[PDB]
Amino acid sequence: NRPGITFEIGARLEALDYLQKWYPSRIEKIDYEEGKMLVHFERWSHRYDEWIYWDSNRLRPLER
């Protein structure tokens, strides 16, 4: 039970949207160079996967 980017593939990060919530979304793949992750969302109607960057907008790492 780790709500946030644990930097591990398969970790459940917090993504914002849909409800404007930071909802536990799962990392499917990580790009470390650009610093993006292929995140798979549970509550997401358009697509289910997306490449977004950590805390660039709607992505939150772990508590700290």
Coordinates of C-alpha atoms in Angstrom, one line a residue:
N1 CA 0.0 0.0 0.0
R2 CA 2.2 2.6 -1.4
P3 CA 0.4 5.6 -3.0
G4 CA 3.0 7.2 -5.0
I5 CA 5.8 6.6 -7.5
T6 CA 8.0 4.1 -5.8
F7 CA 10.2 4.3 -9.0
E8 CA 9.4 0.6 -9.6
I9 CA 7.7 -0.8 -12.6
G10 CA 4.4 -2.0 -11.2
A11 CA 4.3 0.5 -8.4
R12 CA 1.1 2.4 -7.8
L13 CA 1.7 6.1 -8.2
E14 CA -0.7 8.9 -7.8
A15 CA -2.1 10.4 -11.0
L16 CA -4.4 13.3 -11.1
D17 CA -7.4 13.7 -13.4
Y18 CA -10.8 12.1 -14.0
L19 CA -12.1 13.1 -10.7
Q20 CA -9.3 15.6 -10.2
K21 CA -8.1 13.1 -7.8
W22 CA -4.8 11.7 -7.2
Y23 CA -5.7 8.2 -7.8
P24 CA -3.4 5.1 -7.5
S25 CA -2.3 4.4 -11.0
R26 CA 0.1 1.7 -12.0
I27 CA 3.5 2.1 -13.6
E28 CA 3.7 -0.3 -16.6
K29 CA 7.1 0.9 -17.8
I30 CA 9.5 3.7 -16.9
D31 CA 11.5 6.1 -19.0
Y32 CA 14.3 7.4 -16.9
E33 CA 16.0 9.6 -19.5
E34 CA 13.1 11.8 -20.3
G35 CA 11.6 10.8 -17.1
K36 CA 8.2 9.5 -18.0
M37 CA 6.3 6.5 -17.2
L38 CA 3.8 4.5 -19.0
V39 CA 1.1 4.6 -16.5
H40 CA -1.9 2.5 -16.6
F41 CA -4.9 4.0 -15.0
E42 CA -7.9 2.2 -13.6
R43 CA -10.4 5.0 -14.0
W44 CA -9.7 6.4 -17.4
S45 CA -12.1 6.2 -20.4
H46 CA -10.0 7.5 -23.2
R47 CA -7.1 5.1 -23.4
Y48 CA -5.9 3.3 -20.3
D49 CA -2.2 3.9 -20.7
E50 CA -0.3 7.1 -21.1
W51 CA 3.3 8.5 -21.0
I52 CA 3.4 11.2 -18.5
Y53 CA 6.3 12.8 -16.6
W54 CA 6.5 12.5 -12.8
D55 CA 5.0 15.7 -11.1
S56 CA 5.1 17.6 -14.3
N57 CA 1.4 18.0 -14.0
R58 CA -0.8 15.3 -12.6
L59 CA 1.7 12.7 -11.3
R60 CA 2.6 12.4 -7.7
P61 CA 5.4 10.4 -6.2
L62 CA 5.2 8.8 -2.8
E63 CA 4.5 10.7 0.5
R64 CA 8.3 11.6 0.7

